């Protein structure tokens, strides 16, 4: 008698792809050092700001999956002569990545530039270090990190994706896996519906990639852009992400009632309310309380949010 079945720890059931998930492999103390293979501006010269897509080599060292983030420890020192604290960035590439070999990682980085009260133009530390990275240079990477935006296991589920600006990053990751890759253990066949809000057309992130997936899966991939400074509804209101969702209020409410519908929200801290505003009205008209309904959705792993 050499064996025993040690009693199992009690565990919550999960609908998301967390099987053998990896978080916090590399710490800022000793980050994985990769290199920059390419770094391109993906917004027009005309856009209000600059967003860049960049790919780093990882030689397979960083075991990330769709929906996770990696931290970056930007080179240099702060005003006190101290090395910089890491900043987190949602991975914009699928687990197999942009080269199909499972040895790289991609980011979608908005260059932060503003002017303080004093009137001085200020440059965010990490965002400007990253957008200025030249192919060949090293970059310090930490993580992976995150379990909140992991994709649902069900390959026939409906995945509604709501993102603003760079919040599109984990959705580019999910979609490459769903429409640009043939996975033996995962072939997607549900409905993938993407809503992206950006300020101008020159600001539309990965439009062309999204347009190829639509051309490749015209049935089950739906794409809706919400260009706030160029589009307007019948009332002349700026087309924000929730203003565009409102044009499909009936259909979305119906899917929200299906049990295999998972909703993901990523991007600006504020997008959150406009959406809830849109939701309460719908549920209301159906004699349902969004407050209560939302709770269930969240506990049911169907209303996933990651905003900054
Ligand atoms: C989980 C997670 C995922 C993220 N994903 C991404 C991503 O994919 N892409 C991306 O670009 N960002 C992402 N971020 C944000 C990112 O981590 C950094 O916060 C961002 O890049 C700015 O950092 P920085 O080092 O450039 O700026 P910092 O040097 O840290 O400066 C930021 C500070 O400047 C001030 N500030 C910022 N904006 C303004 C403004 N408009 N006016 C006045 N003061 C201001 C604030 O005090 C702020 O704390 C994510 C954040 C989190 C938490
Ligand atoms: N995992 C994460 O947590 C994660 C990942 C990626 C990014 N982010 C965060 O999300 C943000 C994306 O930054 P970004 O500069 O790329 O955004 P952005 O370019 O400034 O604008 C995004 C769009 O959202 C609009 N918008 C503003 N307020 C809104 C609201 N209340 N509801 C709906 N839409 C609204 C803007 O319209 P107007 O300009 O006309 O107002 C604009 O069209 C960053 O702050 C970043 O920190 C977080």
UniProtKB/Swiss-Prot annotation:
The alphabetized UniProt keywords are: Chloroplast, Electron transport, FAD, Flavoprotein, Membrane, NADP, Oxidoreductase, Photosynthesis, Plastid, Thylakoid, Transit peptide, Transport
Q: Which cysteines are joined by disulfide bonds?
A: none
**What's an example GO BP annotation here?**
photosynthesis
The record's listing under PANTHER family reads: PTHR43314
Give the function comment from the record: May play a key role in regulating the relative amounts of cyclic and non-cyclic electron flow to meet the demands of the plant for ATP and reducing power.
Q: What is this protein called?
A: Ferredoxin--NADP reductase, leaf isozyme, chloroplastic
Pathway connected to this protein: Energy metabolism; photosynthesis
Would the keyword Hydrolase turn up in this protein's UniProt record? no
Positions binding NADP(+) in this chain are 90, 110, 166, 198-199, 228-229, 238, 267-268, 306
Pfam families registered for this protein in UniProt = NAD_binding_1 (PF00175)
Source species, please?
Answer: Pisum sativum (Garden pea)
Family statement drawn from the similarity comment of this UniProt entry = Belongs to the ferredoxin--NADP reductase type 1 family.
Give the superkingdom in one word.
Eukaryota
Its UniProt miscellaneous note says: FNR is probably attached to the membrane by a specific binding protein.
InterPro entries (alphabetical): FAD-bd_FR_type (IPR017927), Flavoprot_Pyr_Nucl_cyt_Rdtase (IPR001709), FNR (IPR015701), FNR_nucleotide-bd (IPR039261), FNR_plant_Cyanobacteria (IPR035442), OxRdtase_FAD/NAD-bd (IPR001433), Riboflavin_synthase-like_b-brl (IPR017938)
Question: Which residues does the UniProt record annotate as the domain FAD-binding FR-type?
Answer: 29-151
Lineage, uppermost ranks: Eukaryota, Viridiplantae, Streptophyta, Embryophyta, Tracheophyta
The entry's localization annotation reads: Plastid, Chloroplast stroma; Plastid, Chloroplast thylakoid membrane
Q: How does it sit in the membrane?
A: Peripheral membrane protein
User: Which reactions is this enzyme annotated as catalysing?
Assistant: 2 reduced [2Fe-2S]-[ferredoxin] + NADP(+) + H(+) = 2 oxidized [2Fe-2S]-[ferredoxin] + NADPH
Query: GO CC terms for this protein?
Result: chloroplast stroma; chloroplast thylakoid membrane
The protein's enzyme class: oxidoreductase
- Residues annotated as binding FAD: 87-90, 108-110, 114, 125-127, 166
């Amino acid at each position: 008698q050499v064996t025993t079945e040690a009693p199992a720890k009690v565990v919550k059931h999960s609908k998301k792809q967390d099987e053998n998930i990896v978080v916090n492999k590399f710490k800022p103390k000793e980050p994985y050092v990769g290199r920059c293979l390419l770094n391109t501006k993906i917004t027009g010269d005309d856009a209000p700001g600059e967003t860049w897509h960049m790919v780093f080599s990882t030689e397979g060292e960083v075991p990330y999956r769709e929906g996770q983030s990696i931290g970056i420890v930007p080179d240099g020192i702060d005003k006190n002569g101290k090395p910089h604290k890491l900043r987190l960035y949602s991975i914009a590439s699928s687990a197999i990545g942009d080269f199909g070999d499972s040895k790289t990682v991609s980011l979608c980085v908005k260059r932060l530039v503003y002017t303080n009260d004093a009137g001085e133009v200020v440059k965010g530390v990490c965002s400007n270090f990253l957008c200025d990275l030249k192919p060949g240079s090293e970059v310090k990477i930490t993580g992976p990190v995150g379990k909140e935006m992991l994709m649902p296991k069900d390959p026939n589920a409906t995945v509604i994706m709501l993102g603003t600006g760079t919040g599109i990053a984990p959705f580019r990751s999910f979609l490459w896996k769903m429409f640009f890759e043939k996975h033996e253990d995962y072939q997607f066949n549900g409905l993938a519906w993407l809503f992206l809000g950006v300020p101008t057309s020159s600001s539309l992130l990965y439009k062309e990639e999204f347009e190829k997936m639509k051309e490749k899966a015209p049935e089950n991939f739906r794409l809706d852009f919400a260009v706030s400074r160029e589009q307007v509804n019948d009332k002349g209101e700026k087309m924000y992400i929730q203003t565009r969702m409102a044009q499909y209020a009936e259909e979305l409410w119906e899917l929200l009632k299906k049990d295999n519908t998972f909703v993901y929200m990523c991007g600006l801290k504020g997008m959150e309310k406009g959406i809830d505003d849109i939701m309460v009205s719908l549920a209301a008209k159906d004699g349902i309380d969004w407050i209560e309904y939302k709770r269930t959705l969240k506990k049911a792993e169907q209303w996933n949010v990651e905003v900054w």
